[PDB]
Ligand binder design. Sequence first.
Ligand code: BCL
Ligand code: BCL
Ligand code: BCL
Ligand code: BCL
Ligand code: BCL
Ligand code: BCL
Ligand code: CLA
Ligand SMILES: CCCCCCCCCCCCCCCC(=O)OC[C@@H](CO[C@H]1O[C@@H](CO)[C@H](O)[C@@H](O)[C@@H]1O)OC(=O)CCCCCCCCCCCCCCC
Ligand SMILES: CCCCCCCCCCCCCCCC(=O)OC[C@H](COP(=O)(O)OC[C@@H](O)CO)OC(=O)CCCCCCCCCCCCCCC
Ligand code: SF4
Ligand SMILES: [Ca+2]
Lengths: 359, 359, 667
Amino acid sequence: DVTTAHSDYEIVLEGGSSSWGKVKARAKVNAPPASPLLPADCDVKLNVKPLDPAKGFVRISAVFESIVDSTKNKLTIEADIANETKERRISVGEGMVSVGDFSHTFSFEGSVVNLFYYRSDAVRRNVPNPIYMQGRQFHDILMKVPLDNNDLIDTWEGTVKAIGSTGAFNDWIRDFWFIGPAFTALNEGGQRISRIEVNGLNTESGPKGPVGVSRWRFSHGGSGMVDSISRWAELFPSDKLNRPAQVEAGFRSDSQGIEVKVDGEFPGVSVDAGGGLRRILNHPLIPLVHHGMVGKFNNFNVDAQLKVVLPKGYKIRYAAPQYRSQNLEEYRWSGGAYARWVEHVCKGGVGQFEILYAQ
Amino acid sequence: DVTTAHSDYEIVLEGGSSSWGKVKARAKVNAPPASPLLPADCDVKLNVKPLDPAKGFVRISAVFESIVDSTKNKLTIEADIANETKERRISVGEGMVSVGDFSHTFSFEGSVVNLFYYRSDAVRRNVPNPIYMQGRQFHDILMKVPLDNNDLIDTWEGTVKAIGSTGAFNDWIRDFWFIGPAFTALNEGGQRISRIEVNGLNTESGPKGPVGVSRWRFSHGGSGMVDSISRWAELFPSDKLNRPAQVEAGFRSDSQGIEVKVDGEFPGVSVDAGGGLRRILNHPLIPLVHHGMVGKFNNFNVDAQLKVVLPKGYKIRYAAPQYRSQNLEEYRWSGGAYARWVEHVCKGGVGQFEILYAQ
Amino acid sequence: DAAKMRRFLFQRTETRSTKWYQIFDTEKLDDEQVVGGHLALLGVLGFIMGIYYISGIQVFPWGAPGFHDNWFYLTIKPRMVSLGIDTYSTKTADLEAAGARLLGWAAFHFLVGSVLIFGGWRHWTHNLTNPFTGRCGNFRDFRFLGKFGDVVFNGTSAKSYKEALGPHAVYMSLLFLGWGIVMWAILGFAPIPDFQTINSETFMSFVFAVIFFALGIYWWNNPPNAAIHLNDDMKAAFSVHLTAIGYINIALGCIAFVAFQQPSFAPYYKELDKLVFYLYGEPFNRVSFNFVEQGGKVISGAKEFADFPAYAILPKSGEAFGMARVVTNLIVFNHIICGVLYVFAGVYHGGQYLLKIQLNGMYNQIKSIWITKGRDQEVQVKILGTVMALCFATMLSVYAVIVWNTICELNIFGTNITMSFYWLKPLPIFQWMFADPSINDWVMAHVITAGSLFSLIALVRIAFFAHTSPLWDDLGLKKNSYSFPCLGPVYGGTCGVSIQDQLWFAMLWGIKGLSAVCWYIDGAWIASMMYGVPAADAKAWDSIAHLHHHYTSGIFYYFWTETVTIFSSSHLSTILMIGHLVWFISFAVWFEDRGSRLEGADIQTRTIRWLGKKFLNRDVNFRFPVLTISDSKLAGTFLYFGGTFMLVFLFLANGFYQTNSPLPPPV
Ligand code: BCL
Ligand code: BCL
Ligand code: BCL
Ligand code: BCL
Ligand code: BCL
Ligand code: BCL
Ligand code: CLA
Ligand SMILES: CCCCCCCCCCCCCCCC(=O)OC[C@@H](CO[C@H]1O[C@@H](CO)[C@H](O)[C@@H](O)[C@@H]1O)OC(=O)CCCCCCCCCCCCCCC
Ligand SMILES: CCCCCCCCCCCCCCCC(=O)OC[C@H](COP(=O)(O)OC[C@@H](O)CO)OC(=O)CCCCCCCCCCCCCCC
Ligand code: SF4
Ligand SMILES: [Ca+2]
């Protein structure tokens, strides 16, 4: 008993020092989703616009439009993230959270600090392409949610009362923050969530209405698997943002199956590999380790095509798994080794697939 | 050359306000059990009899007759559980534990407290069927085991000595309480076991012989996945116990496979779904998440038939996956989508299968 | 008495209820009962096939006279001749030997049919117990003939329809191989691979048994995931099979027309032109008013012919009556009308399932490109929009040609046949499709094209508007049901909007292309409504266009000529009266007069009560019933469609009267 899933991929890269690449991905799967509520649909939109080159600041937006078991759910975020130093990164942004007839807005002033347990020269010299880097992240959070609704006030009153009466609030809040299967994902990616620390929970008046204010700070450590820690500099190509970059995706899910559409350009798709050779960015490990969690429930047959388009004059030096066919500057992957590697990484495997293209 | 498993299911429901349903389940599987000792066989019996309607008290019995690697093992429980309040539930009961030529009896005075981290009206309002509810449970335990055997005395002396000499007894007792793979089950269902607290370990004389007495209290938190916490009111239909209810099951296991038989009536099989529509109770999540732990070791083919029998005048308004056939009052599920959902939930999936039947 | 009276009309309503013609529906039967029912009918089919064999005997084994000719066996006689069971021989010895063979095949089909009916009762009642070994079997998991099942199916049975494909294909190769052995061992036809002999049907009976077995193993290991939603519901799969079988039947009808009159098929179909047939119901030897034949015989009376006894069916020359093509037209049309009917029902029973899902909301949950690419309302009105446009630009282009040709031939508005489309004929690329290509061939291709796109409109509407349409989404209405007559007078009225009614408008609209086939295969002229009448230029066609053959009649003059032979037969004419009687009665239930009959029935039942009480002492309450509109449109389409083609049989069975001598101009 085996079901079938069909998918198509596409990466178009520019020449020179440009790290800009266009990525398109279509997928269609015939097994039920692990979600205990169906049907669940979802559309996501990300847009990043450079504000100023010298400062390095950029404006990032995010819209989530998901209907879960006929319940409209929307989350909106608008933020200004910039590079302060090699380990610190401050973000100022506003957003809105709406579920059915309920909605509440929030404003945040936050900074994230990222440190590597060690920084040795020998590791850099002897390992040309390191994957695992051991580290920890620290978030400073100043949330500003106006208590407009009757329910908001009650959630705040209850929260303050709980803190006041329960000593174990810093610990047991991690059981709430990661609801249902989210708690299990933490151990799965080798990620440790430390106890939150409440600097202050003070109600401050605002022109509209009373504004519950929270000033908290937390930390979390990655054994190396986590990409936010292991790759802190790579997930924010702010300085390479010469023009605006957008990633647009969406998916439909129900008892019958899942339909997914993804498209968008952004920098960082191509990174230097040494000896004048360029290379597609190492696959994020967290998404694969997180999908092996739901991808191991139905035996499936893989039908995936990966069309990679390179710049004029730019030819692969090496790829494993090797491209099935080639069309001048365009190279194709389908079948054989590649549709084994897809079966590998769709079930949680993180095996390396490397493409080196030199001019 | 190819593994296969066969199964039969059956639910018969009454009309009116009755939540009474008859459930029969037969299964036969051809892969070896994960148990590192075989053959292991086991018969379980549960009977609940209402004592008085006004008090809400009920008498529950449990018998376990299991032979493990030719070692007869029996556990017997007789208890009186009643509803004190919305979050507290006191139980008074006695039981016996026999392994081979060893046996010891126990008496317990216990209460369980269940609190939800939050209780918001908007959730209730915006959600028609809530699956995940975040919570914690607290057990007050007063165990009374008479030290009749030479071994009991030694287990008690040793326990007291261990507490006296080891500071980390509250922590390292969780390594003993959950033996082999039951500890890994804790993280799997998003369930946290807090450290036990020993109120007292005092030997009190009894007419028969010295009686080691333990007064302990512990807690455990559910991210929402745990059904004891998320569904505290539903797992005890005491007030709906107009007549006695019994669940009888048993299973045989060895190198060749598992044979399982389950049958019994009890209330709570049918719950109101809104708009005058009734619905089969949401599948327990803990059993599925716990079976995905042993069900992912052998590729298998599913042969499952689910015969559902409804009351006179009662037809289904909606089901996904849809019933293969209908035959008058009864509706049948087999094959196609349903035998995909069975392969989904037998490997640990928790995907929703909903039946709505209105008069 | 109002209440009691209303309990009755309520007993005959337009709402959902159980009807006698829906008791064997897919919904109320499991997969073991479909297999059991198919087996019990094939057992009945074998019993039927064994009667078409006994009827074919001309002289019995003991040498006495047997049965007269009948149309049932005639359509199978060229096949039994092809297989050697039947032989075209003047010698009475060959006729007596042949009869023994048919009787033997009839008894054999009686035995095998009795087994399939028995094997169709136990499967139906799930009482599938081996009477020899006390142990019963399992439907879900069985060995499938023991050792054979283990080697090919790994000893396991399919648990789902997509899995049953491999085993079903393997079962087919056991029939392809089974027939290839019967032909070789019992019928003596060795597999010689040359395609002008019956021996080629044994060679390809083994090639096909190899293709299917290999194909049946590939689908056992790799079952197709296409149209997965079908595996969930029986009627979804049963309807796609019926949409597929109909195109298969139309294909069988179209190849049996090209093949049955090929030179290689001459020994079996053309060969019939040299036989004298005593068909039943044909004019017999008449006798005088005062005709009494006593023991002495032929005394005090007179009879017609005198070369045959009183009341004896007279001979009929096969060449004059065109027997060969009559049989070829009876088989080709049968598998074409049925094919068309099967396609319409596949779409109907399919949209009957599309309604069930839209109501339950499973419609948005399907992932198959077969439903997903069809749930957009904008895409629907584009598909239907092009179908309607194509149907219009082709029904008006070909009808105006036929009308213009009719006007030119009758010299209306001072126009001669010279101004008609006698120069228009199929292009040279297509000329191979036709014998003596002409305008009669250009028109027929475009009429079928227009006749398909016309009835396709009613089919695209069943597929797309089963629950809602762009108009009813506009009018804010739901099509709760597949057999609801109308919503009432509202919005200028909305009658005939359900998919069952759209099925009726596909069957009714399909009578035109279903008649362009009857007319075209009988050598009738289709380019003009009037060809061959004793009028201005009707008889000038054969020489204006230089046709090698001479068509029997034109669309209108077809009824006059073809019926000269129908009126001569006392049985073909009884069909003309019965078939017409059945057809008009459809107007009584198809016309919008359902309410009138009801108030009339009230006067009927009131008058009967009145007459019974005034004359007798008893009380006569019968409460005269009246059919419902949806129950009317049902019986209306059966009387219309069923009387329309009760008479199309007379056109095909009256003889094939196309000739090979084109007429000179009537100058
Ligand atoms: C998921 C792994 C980490 C994580 C990873 C990071 C990273 C990485 C950083 C932040 C930083 C921040 N984090 Mg954090 N953060 C986590 C958990 C949290 C939680 C929480 C609910 O527990 C909170 C309140 C915060 C809060 C914050 C903000 C103060 C700050 C900016 C967020 C923002 O603008 O998002 C915007 C809102 C969104 C919905 C964006 C979601 C984006 C997803 C995750 C990835 C999309 C990119 C896609 C793969 C490629 C797109 C290219 C296009 C050009 C965009 N973090 C977990 C533990 N956090 C940032 C910082 O340094 O501030 C100084 C930052 O760089
Ligand atoms: C399994 C998930 C939870 C759990 C869930 C609950 C629930 C739920 C409640 C109890 C409550 C109690 N728990 Mg506790 N409890 C757990 C761990 C423990 C441990 C331990 C060894 O660590 C101990 C000593 C206890 C002790 C106790 C008792 C003081 C008390 C009554 C138990 C009883 O009578 O069982 C009877 C003995 C048995 C063997 C029964 C086993 C039943 C199984 C688990 C389910 C059977 C029902 C079946 C699905 C449907 C049957 C319908 C028929 C009509 C019966 N709990 C874990 C952490 N506990 C109860 C209380 O509130 O008391 C006031 C109660 O309602
Ligand atoms: C005639 C024009 C349509 C047609 C229109 C209808 C209509 C209208 C109805 C059905 C219904 C049925 N159809 Mg249909 N159906 C046709 C062709 C077929 C064929 C085929 C021979 O290929 C089959 C196997 C079926 C199968 C079936 C069943 C799923 C169902 C109940 C049958 C029954 O009880 O009959 C009656 C049982 C008998 C013993 C009487 C004799 C029937 C003989 C054996 C022929 C069977 C097919 C015939 C059309 C059945 C209906 C006869 C009515 C007088 C219309 N249809 C064609 C395509 N079908 C019903 C249903 O529930 O649909 C959802 C229904 O209301
Ligand atoms: C099965 C139900 C009935 C039955 C009903 C019929 C019917 C109905 C007919 C005959 C006819 C015949 N039968 Mg009988 N017959 C039965 C049992 C038998 C048995 C036996 C082994 O018991 C034998 C030896 C015969 C013998 C014969 C011959 C005398 C004769 C010609 C058969 C033929 O051409 O087969 C060739 C057979 C095959 C190649 C087998 C496979 C057929 C395949 C599966 C389907 C073809 C159509 C397919 C859909 C085409 C498109 C391709 C698609 C993509 C799938 N019958 C039982 C009792 N019999 C025929 C006749 O008299 O003609 C005048 C005829 O039409
Ligand atoms: C033409 C014959 C009909 C048929 C008519 C019968 C008859 C007759 C009998 C059964 C009975 C049985 N049927 Mg049935 N049945 C058919 C199709 C099937 C199919 C299938 C989907 O292919 C299956 C799984 C079954 C299942 C079963 C068995 C489990 C059961 C066994 C008792 C017995 O005597 O068994 C012997 C059979 C088996 C142990 C099963 C394995 C062998 C095969 C499948 C048996 C059917 C005949 C075989 C296919 C014929 C030759 C086909 C060649 C291609 C020419 N049948 C075939 C097509 N069925 C029995 C019953 O109802 O008893 C009261 C019985 O005697
Ligand atoms: C002068 C053009 C004539 C015509 C003359 C021919 C000829 C000649 C032949 C066919 C043949 C065919 N015709 Mg024609 N055909 C016309 C219009 C149509 C229409 C249509 C509704 O638009 C359809 C569906 C068909 C269908 C078909 C197929 C059965 C077959 C396909 C090959 C073909 O056309 O080759 C040749 C096609 C062309 C030379 C050009 C086709 C132009 C397209 C198809 C549309 C024409 C314009 C349109 C009709 C404008 C009318 C609008 C109205 C005023 C509203 N024809 C017009 C009226 N047709 C062949 C066959 O086998 O006949 C038996 C053949 O030999
Ligand atoms: C032969 C065809 C025929 C027959 C017999 C009838 C008969 C009848 N019609 Mg109908 N009708 C017909 C065709 C026919 N109609 C058509 C084509 C239409 C469409 C325009 C209508 C539209 C229609 C409407 C709108 C109404 C009726 C009504 C009536 C009834 C009122 C007359 C009455 O009481 O006695 C009339 C006299 C007789 C019936 C004597 C019997 C005549 C023969 C012997 C009947 C038996 C022959 C029959 C054809 C056998 C069938 C054989 C089979 C092979 C087909 C009557 C039962 C009215 C009514 O009350 O409805 C119940 C009514 O409101 N007629
Ligand atoms: C429900 C609505 C539909 C009803 C059902 C219609 C299905 C039938 C499907 C049409 C087939 C008819 C079948 C009988 C086969 C038969 O006749 O084949 C032979 C041959 C002539 O043979 C000789 O016939 C003599 C009789 O007079 C002559 O004198 C002589 O000169 C000539 O050589 O006919 C063609 O070539 C067939 C023409 C029609 C051409 C088909 C064009 C259709 C193709 C294009 C698209 C159509 C579909 C559009 C989408 C719906
Ligand atoms: C003193 C007062 C006088 C009134 C007393 C008596 C009044 C008249 C009542 C009897 C005369 C009516 C006789 C016919 C009158 C007549 O013609 O009525 C036409 C009739 C319409 O019926 P209604 O729904 O009007 O109901 C009439 C009843 O109320 C009877 O009065 O048409 C049909 O029933 C369709 C055929 C159904 C079957 C469809 C089968 C399709 C395939 C065909 C295969 C062969 C057909 C054979 C099938 C049977
Ligand atoms: S006459 Fe019949 S179809 Fe017309 S509106 Fe009335 S009920 Fe509807
Ligand atoms: Ca004729």
